[PDB]
Structure 1
Amino acid sequence: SVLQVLHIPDERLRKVAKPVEEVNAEIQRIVDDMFETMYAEEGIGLAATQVDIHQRIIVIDVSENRDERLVLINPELLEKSGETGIEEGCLSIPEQRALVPRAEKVKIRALDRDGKPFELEADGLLAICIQHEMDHLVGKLFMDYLSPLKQQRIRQKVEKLDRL
């Protein structure tokens, strides 16, 4: 199923997710719906928070042909380094994009869709995305890195869209 994606300024977006207690069928369905939703929404990543599910779950596909599925359950940032930034966009902040500072490289530990633990070292688009998603899990948005002026503006643009 395709789930509804919240938009700012829904305060549900500022909630802090809990850790998945056990990777089971219920969890795997959530994972499956999140992939469907992400591809439907044309995003390269999605955090459970965005669909009103407050558990540490993230799905990713940064692939060019959109055929590389990546699931991060209960992810942990192990090491990080460098600084970088692109013009990021968010499914929760429709049509707004901005450069935000990010580590250039990251190393994380997580559980896969089968609840199997794995380690991954990433860089380029993949690392920034991973960072974007993990921030969601702690109720943080990209616009938070910006100026109040810029923040107000983004907010206004979003409310007008959602109005139409």
Structure 2
Amino acid sequence: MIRDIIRMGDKRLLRVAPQVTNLGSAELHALVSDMFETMGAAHGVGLAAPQIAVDLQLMVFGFEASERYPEAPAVPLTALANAQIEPLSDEMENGWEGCLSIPGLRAVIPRYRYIRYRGFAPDGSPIEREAEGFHARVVQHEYDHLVGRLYPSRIENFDTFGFDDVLSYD
């Protein structure tokens, strides 16, 4: 079932979400399944549970081909609960971000180029991966949602913030 994606301005995206405590549950599986479906219909690369108004530390992401990027490399389809993130270097990198809670817009955002993230698959088994570049950016972006942060508050260069159909920054 496709959920409504709530848009920026909705208090519910400002919350710090509590942990997922029903790993392996049929309820949790139904929720993630809805998440992938919603992300897919909206052509997202990632989706955080608070974006469909569920106050949980849960995100889905990944894709083979993005209509949106387009030529970002493939990121594996992942559902990850109780995400915690550590950078593996100080190196930052600028890239375009957008949000389905913010349709039409985009901006350039510095993120860590190299991270390890840790958490749980919905069946309860542990996930830990090192990631870089676009992969790492997506997971940093979705994580911010879990902690009530959106991308505008990370913009350093405001010249790069605008509507997707109007921007012409490199």
* TM-score of Structure 1 vs Structure 2, range by shorter chain: 0.7 to 0.9
Give ranges in structure 1 of 5+ residues lacking alignment.
Answer: 158-164
In the alignment, is the contact (CA less than 8 A) between 1:85 and 1:128 conserved in 2?
A: no
AA paired with 2:153? D
After superposition, residues 34-49 of structure 1 pair within 5 angstroms as 34-49=35-50
Give the corresponding residue for 1:60: 61
Secondary structure of the 2:112 match is: coil
Give the corresponding residue for 1:77: 85
TM-score by length of 2: 0.82
Distance in 2 (alpha carbons) for counterparts of 1:52 and 1:40: 17
Give the corresponding residue for 2:116: 107
- Pairing 1:118–2:119 present: no
The superposition leaves residues 85-124 of structure 1 with CA deviations (integer Å, 9 ceiling, x where unpaired) of 2111000011100011100011011111211012100002
In the alignment, is the contact (CA less than 8 A) between 1:62 and 1:126 conserved in 2?
A: no
In the alignment, is the contact (CA less than 8 A) between 2:117 and 2:129 conserved in 1?
A: yes
Give the corresponding residue for 2:144: 135
TM-score by length of 1: 0.85
Secondary structure of the 2:13 match is: helix
Task: Give the paired residue count.
Answer: 152
In the alignment, is the contact (CA less than 8 A) between 2:75 and 2:135 conserved in 1?
A: no
The superposition leaves residues 30-64 of structure 1 with CA deviations (integer Å, 9 ceiling, x where unpaired) of 10000000000100000001000011000011432
Moved more, 70-79 or 57-66: 57-66
Give the corresponding residue for 1:91: 100
Change (3 A) 1:37 1:105: same
Moved more, 102-111 or 66-75: 66-75
- Pairing 1:28–2:29 present: yes
Secondary structure of the 1:26 match is: helix
Give ranges in structure 2 of 5+ residues lacking alignment.
Answer: 67-73, 164-170
In the alignment, is the contact (CA less than 8 A) between 1:5 and 1:50 conserved in 2?
A: yes
Following superposition, which runs of at least 4 residues in structure 1 exceed 4 angstroms of deviation? none
Secondary structure of the 1:31 match is: helix
- CA apart distance, 1:67: 8.7
Distance in 1 (alpha carbons) for counterparts of 2:135 and 2:97: 12
The superposition leaves residues 113-152 of structure 1 with CA deviations (integer Å, 9 ceiling, x where unpaired) of 21101210000210000000000001100011237x88xx
Moved more, 105-114 or 77-86: 77-86
Moved more, 79-88 or 1-10: 79-88
In the alignment, is the contact (CA less than 8 A) between 2:80 and 2:127 conserved in 1?
A: no
The Cα RMSD (Å) is 2.1
